[PDB]
Design a protein around this ligand. Sequence first.
Ligand SMILES: [K+]
Ligand SMILES: [K+]
Ligand SMILES: [Mg+2]
Ligand SMILES: [Mg+2]
Ligand SMILES: [Mg+2]
Ligand SMILES: [Mg+2]
Ligand SMILES: [Mg+2]
Ligand SMILES: [Mg+2]
Ligand SMILES: [Mg+2]
Ligand SMILES: [Mg+2]
Ligand SMILES: [Mg+2]
Ligand SMILES: [Mg+2]
Ligand SMILES: [Mg+2]
Ligand SMILES: [Mg+2]
Ligand SMILES: [Mg+2]
Ligand SMILES: [Mg+2]
Ligand SMILES: [Mg+2]
Ligand SMILES: [Mg+2]
Lengths: 206, 153, 118, 262
Amino acid sequence: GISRDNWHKRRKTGGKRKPYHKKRKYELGRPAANTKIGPRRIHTVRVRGGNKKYRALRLDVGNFSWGSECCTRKTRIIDVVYNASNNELVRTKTLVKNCIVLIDSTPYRQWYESHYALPLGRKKGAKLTPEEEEILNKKRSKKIQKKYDERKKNAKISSLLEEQFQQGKLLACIASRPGQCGRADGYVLEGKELEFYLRKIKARKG
Amino acid sequence: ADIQTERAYQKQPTIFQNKKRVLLGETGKEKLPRYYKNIGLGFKTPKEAIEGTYIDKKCPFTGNVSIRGRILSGVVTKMKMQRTIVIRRDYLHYIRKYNRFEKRHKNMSVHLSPCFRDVQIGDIVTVGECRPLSKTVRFNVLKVTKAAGTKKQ
Amino acid sequence: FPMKQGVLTHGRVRLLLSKGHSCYRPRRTGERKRKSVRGCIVDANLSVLNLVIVKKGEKDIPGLTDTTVPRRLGPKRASRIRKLFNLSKEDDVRQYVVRKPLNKEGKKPRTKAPKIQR
Amino acid sequence: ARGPKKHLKRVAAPKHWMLDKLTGVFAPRPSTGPHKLRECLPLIIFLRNRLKYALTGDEVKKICMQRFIKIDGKVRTDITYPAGFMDVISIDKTGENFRLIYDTKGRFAVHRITPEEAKYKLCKVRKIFVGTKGIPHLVTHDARTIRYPDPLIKVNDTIQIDLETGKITDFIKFDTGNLCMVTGGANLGRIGVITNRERHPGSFDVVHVKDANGNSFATRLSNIFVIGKGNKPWISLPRGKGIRLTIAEERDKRLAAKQSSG
RNA sequence: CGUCGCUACUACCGAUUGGAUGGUUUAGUGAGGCCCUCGGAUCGGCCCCGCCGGGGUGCCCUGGCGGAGCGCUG
RNA sequence: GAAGCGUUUACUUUGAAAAAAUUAGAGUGUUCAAAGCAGGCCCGAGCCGCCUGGAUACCGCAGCUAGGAAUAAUGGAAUAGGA
RNA sequence: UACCUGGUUGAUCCUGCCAGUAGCAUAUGCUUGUCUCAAAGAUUAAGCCAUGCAUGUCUAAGUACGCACGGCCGGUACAGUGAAACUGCGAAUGGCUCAUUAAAUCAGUUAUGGUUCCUUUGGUCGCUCGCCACUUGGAUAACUGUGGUAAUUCUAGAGCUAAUACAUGCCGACGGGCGCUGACCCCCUUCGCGGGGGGGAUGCGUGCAUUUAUCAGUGGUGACUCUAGAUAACCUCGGGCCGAUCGCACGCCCCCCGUGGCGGCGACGACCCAUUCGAACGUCUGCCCUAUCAACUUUCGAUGGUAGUCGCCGUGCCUACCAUGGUGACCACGGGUGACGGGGAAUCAGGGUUCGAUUCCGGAGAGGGAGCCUGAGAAACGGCUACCACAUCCAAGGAAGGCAGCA
RNA sequence: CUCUGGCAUGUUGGAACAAUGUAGGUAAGGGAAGUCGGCAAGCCGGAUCCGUAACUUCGGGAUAAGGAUUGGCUCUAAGGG
Ligand SMILES: [K+]
Ligand SMILES: [K+]
Ligand SMILES: [Mg+2]
Ligand SMILES: [Mg+2]
Ligand SMILES: [Mg+2]
Ligand SMILES: [Mg+2]
Ligand SMILES: [Mg+2]
Ligand SMILES: [Mg+2]
Ligand SMILES: [Mg+2]
Ligand SMILES: [Mg+2]
Ligand SMILES: [Mg+2]
Ligand SMILES: [Mg+2]
Ligand SMILES: [Mg+2]
Ligand SMILES: [Mg+2]
Ligand SMILES: [Mg+2]
Ligand SMILES: [Mg+2]
Ligand SMILES: [Mg+2]
Ligand SMILES: [Mg+2]
C-alpha cells in the first residue's frame, strides 16, 4: 500500500535507485484522518507492536488552556479560521496539529467571574440577574472580600482578548494531533502570536 | 526583516511569552527570555545565539537537536541554501598494491545556524552528528574558524 | 451451495468470507477465503429448503409432532440450573443438578453427574 | 528474517562455552534472561560439559525437572536458563555450591564455594533513577531491580546483595585503588586494582588496572566490576587468583607439575 | 608484388518504413485489497403492560400465553 | 587532584574493542597420518576417585586511546584591527 | 625450491611470441585389492512436477454430562484414564536457492538524547475515598438428529452444554488526608475603624497510564525540551489498569460461640518500568568493467526552509507555500557483469593474480507482479485475494494449485 | 445573431409531393472488394499541457508522428495606479 520507504526516492546526486526488495510492512503508511468538525466519531487502528492509535474523524469538543491564567477548560470548537500549511484545509474545516480555531469562551467566562468577580464578556449588565447578582455580591465576610480585592490588582485582560469575549468566541491554536491521539487539545492565543494571526486573517479577507 | 516572514508563527516551545503582563510590571519592555543550552563536548555556545532573536528549531543551541556520535571537520564550499551549507572533506585512500595514496573527497550538506553570521566560503567548520534534519542532512555546524583571514582589505 | 442471509439476489455470488460470517469456517486465525454462496430468495433451482414451524395447528403431523426428543443434557452453570429449577439460594444446589443415567448391556447400570461451574 | 531467531548453530556459539564440532549442528541457544547470551552459561552445558552429571540433552532435562538446581535462591526448571556472572548455582541434594566466575583465560570455571558464602551475591548497579511518587530505583547488571536504595550508590558501583530477601546488605563504591574484575574483552577474567580512570565525553571511559604481579592493563568502563574494598576481595577468588600469565610460564608450570607427578 | 580465374571459410554493407526474443516506460482501460461516506438482509434489549394476576396489603411481589410498545435503542 | 593547550593534520609506537569456523601455531601416540579436542594417575578392589586442557598469534583500510615530534603540509604581528 | 627448456638463421647475439612444465577444479577416458574421512542438479532451465512426508502441541494446576474404558460401593456436583472439541501457544524458527541487487547488499565503526519489542528475569498489582460479590449475563463448540453437492480439510437448518473464549460488574481497604470553595464561630492592637491569626459546617477534584497548557528546580547526562515534583484540566462505547481464574497437602480461631473468620505452597493473569532476544532506520570508510556513457537531477521531489499529514519513530516519506538548489574528469549520470556481500579458497620469495552458487554471519526470493488478514513479530506464500503464464478434476454447474523443503 | 439604415426573395402565382434529375443529409455488418485511378465523399481540425523521427544546404523537417484536457457553478492565489 502507501509506503514510507526512502529507497523509492532519487539519491542525493540525482541518480536512480533500484529497490533490492519489495515493500515491507514496517514501512507502510495509512490514509490521512482528515478530521472534520461534527459529532464525535473516533476510529481505532491497530499499529506496530499491538498498540492502539485513535483516528479522530470528527470532533466537536476540545480541551483548550488559557495559559496566562493557568485555566484549562473543555470547550466546543466552532470553526477553523486559519491554517499555515494549506488554505484549502480551512475551506473544508479540517483540524490538524497547528491550525487555529474559534472556541466557545463560556467556560473561561464562568471561571473568570468565579475567580475574579469582575464583569467580563458582558455588554451592559443586569441581564442574567438570577445568578450574576449573587456572584458579584456573595455578601461575603471581611477576609474573603479582602481575599477578592487582592485578586483584583492583578485582574486585567488584554484589549484583544476582552474584545473576543464580547463576541463570545475565542480563537485558539490546537496543540495535539487529531488522527493520532484522537483529541483536539490546544491553547488560547495571546500577545504577539494573537496579533500575528489576526493580521494574517485580516490580510486573508478584510 | 524580523523573525515572522512566513505563514506560521515562530517561537521557542519552551518559552511562554504571555506571562500575565499586568500593571505590577512595566509594559514594556519586558524582554522575552531566550532558550539556550550547552551542547556539551567542550563546545562554547556563541554569544549571538545567547542573545539573538532568530528562531531555528534545528539550531544546536536554540533548537531541539542533540549532538551525539561523530564529530568531524570540513571546508565550506557553497552557501546557496537556506540555513544549510555544503562542506567538502578531503582525505587520502590507501592502495596496498601500489603502496601509495589516492586523494578522495565527500561533500556533506550540513545545517548552519543563524548564530554563525560571519561565515564565508573556504572556512573550516567542525560539525557534529545529529538526528536526520533533511533528506541528506545529518550534521550540524558547531564551530566556525576563519581561513587565514580575519582581516579584509 | 448453501444460501446466505442478506445476499439479496437469486443465484450464486462469490464472497470474501471472514471469520464467523456463515458458510465457512477458517482453517487458521485471520484467514479469509472467497466462497460461492446462494442468495436468500428461493426459487425453483434449490435442492432443499430448511423450514421451521413457529406455531402449532389443529392436529399432529405423523412422525413429526410426536415422540418429542429430550435435550441431550441439562444445564451446567450454577445459575443456569437455578433459572430452570427456581433455586433461590443454597437450597441443596448440587443435588438438584440433572443426573444422567447410563445403561450399557456389557456393564452394570450407573448414573453419571456433571461438574457444575461457578 | 521475519521474526526472532530461536536457533544457535554450534559453530556460532560463544567460545567460552567450549563446545566441540562433531556432536551436533546446533547449540543450547539460551533463553532470555538476566544476562546476555554471549556472556551466559546455559544450564545444559553446566551440568553436561562442566560437571559431567548428565550425558545428553534429555538427561539434563530429567535433573532439572526433579527440582534440585537452585540458581540465585530460586529453583529453575529451564534447561537453557542463562546463568551468567557470579550467580550462585546451589544443588542442595548434593550439598555443593557454585559461584560462576570467569577463570584466568576469560572462561567460566567451576568454583565450589561454602554454603554460608552462597547466601550473598555481588551485583553491579547499571542505571540509577527515580520513579513515580519520588521513589528511587536501582537496576543491576542482572535484570534485577530494587527500590529505596542508599542514596550514596551511584552508577557502575557494586552492591552487596543477600539471597532470599533481595535487599542491599552493603555496597562497594567505585573509586581509585579498589580491587576489581574485568568482565569483557581481551583482559576478561583479570583481577586487579583500579589505578586510573580516564574519561572521554561522548564516548566510553577507559580505566587502567594493575594486578598483584604489577602488570598494568586497560579496558572499558563497561567491563569493570568492583569485587573488593581496596585490596581485599569480597568473594572467594578462583584458582589462579585472577592473575594473567603469558605463554612463557604456564608451559614451565606444566613441566614442573608433570615432573612432580612423574 | 598485385589484378584476373577456380574452391572453401570469416566477418562487412545492403532495398526489405526486414524478422524474433528480452528490458524500461507514455497514454488508455483497469481486477483486487485497504480506508472513508453511506446502506441496513437480518439479530437482540427496554418500553411487557389486551390478561388472567395480585402483596409489602382497584394501590400488581408476579407464575406464563398473548396482542405488540406500531416507539426508544444496540 | 580539577581546567586549557602557548595551531591543525599527516606519520610512527602503545592500548582498547575487533564472532566462530578457516590459517599459523601450544599441548595431546587417532595404533601413525588426515583429523579430533581430547585426555593422564594410580586400584594393593573401595580409587566409597584424583590431576589437567579446551592456549597463543594474525585480523588489511576506516573509527577510538595514550606517548614521540625527526620528515611533510598548514597557520600567528605588516595600514598592526599585535601580545 | 626466489628454476626454466624446444622453435625464426648457413651459422651468431637479441626482441618476441608459440609450445613445453607444475599446481587446483569441472567433465571425460582406462583401470581399481584394503581402510579412515568426505563433495555431490550451483554452472545450461529462479525451467516443469505425479506421489508420500516435511508443524504441531496438555501439566496436579483453563473448559469433559462421548461409555470409549473404568474405581462404583449405593445415594453422591466432579474417582481416575480419557477420544473429540473450544481455548492458549507455535506455525515469522528451521530448510532450499542465488534470480534480482554496483554506496545498493555487505564488512568494520558508531547512534537511536529519533523508535517498537511475544517471551525471560526483576519491579508493580487495598497508593484511586467512588437487593449477585458466598460469584452476574448471553451464545457457541464438541455431541444427537435432518440433509445438499459429481467433487473439496465445503457446509445448512434443528436441539443441548461450559470457560482463563466472549461480555457485564461490585464489596473491600475506607478511618481519613491533601488542594480549592468557603456558612459561621473563636482569640486578637482593640477604640470610634482597620485588624494578625486560628478553627471550621457545605460542595468540587483527588492513584497509575494518555493529551494539552502552566510553575519551580529528588536524582542523571558531555549535552534533554531527562527523570521526579506542583497546578488547571482532558481521559476516545470497534472505549487502558485497578484479578468474577485453576491445583496441592490440609490446618488455626472459637469470646461472639457452633458457623463463620483466618490461614501456606504454587499456577494462570495483567496497565506500566527495567531486562533479555531482537528488529528497524541512520554516522564514517570501503566495490568489478566501461567515456564507441560528460554532463546528470528538477513538469511527475530534484536540493533546502516553514507548517502540517502519515509512520513505531528522525527525515520530501507525502501535502501546501516558498527558495533554486543538489551531484560531477578526485569520473557524476548511464550501460555491462557469465555480480548475492563477507568470513574465506587456489597459487605461493617479496609484491601480487584469480576464485568465493556452496554448510558460518547478513540480504533476497518462493512461477511473475501487486494487495492484505491474524499476530509482538509477515507485505508470510508447506496464509489469503486478484491478474498474467502454466496446469489438475468435472456429471461441464463448478472445484482445487505452487518441491529455489526431503526423497 | 442583432441595432441604425434598407428591402420584398430577384421578369409570375396556386394546388400536389410520381418517375428521372439538381443541391443537401443519414445508413446496420464489412471497409476500396468499386474504379483507369480513392474520382467523390468521409476522417482530421481551435486552444492548453506534454511529446516529436529519418534526413538536412543545420536554416529546416515540425502543427512531424503520437497522447491528455476542454462545460457549468462556487471560490482561492498571483500579476497594478
Ligand atoms: K402532382
Ligand atoms: K481500390
Ligand atoms: Mg471453574
Ligand atoms: Mg546474478
Ligand atoms: Mg557466497
Ligand atoms: Mg520472502
Ligand atoms: Mg501472540
Ligand atoms: Mg508473497
Ligand atoms: Mg426563394
Ligand atoms: Mg416574389
Ligand atoms: Mg433583376
Ligand atoms: Mg454504413
Ligand atoms: Mg459501420
Ligand atoms: Mg481493385
Ligand atoms: Mg474490379
Ligand atoms: Mg478529393
Ligand atoms: Mg514528415
Ligand atoms: Mg471543471
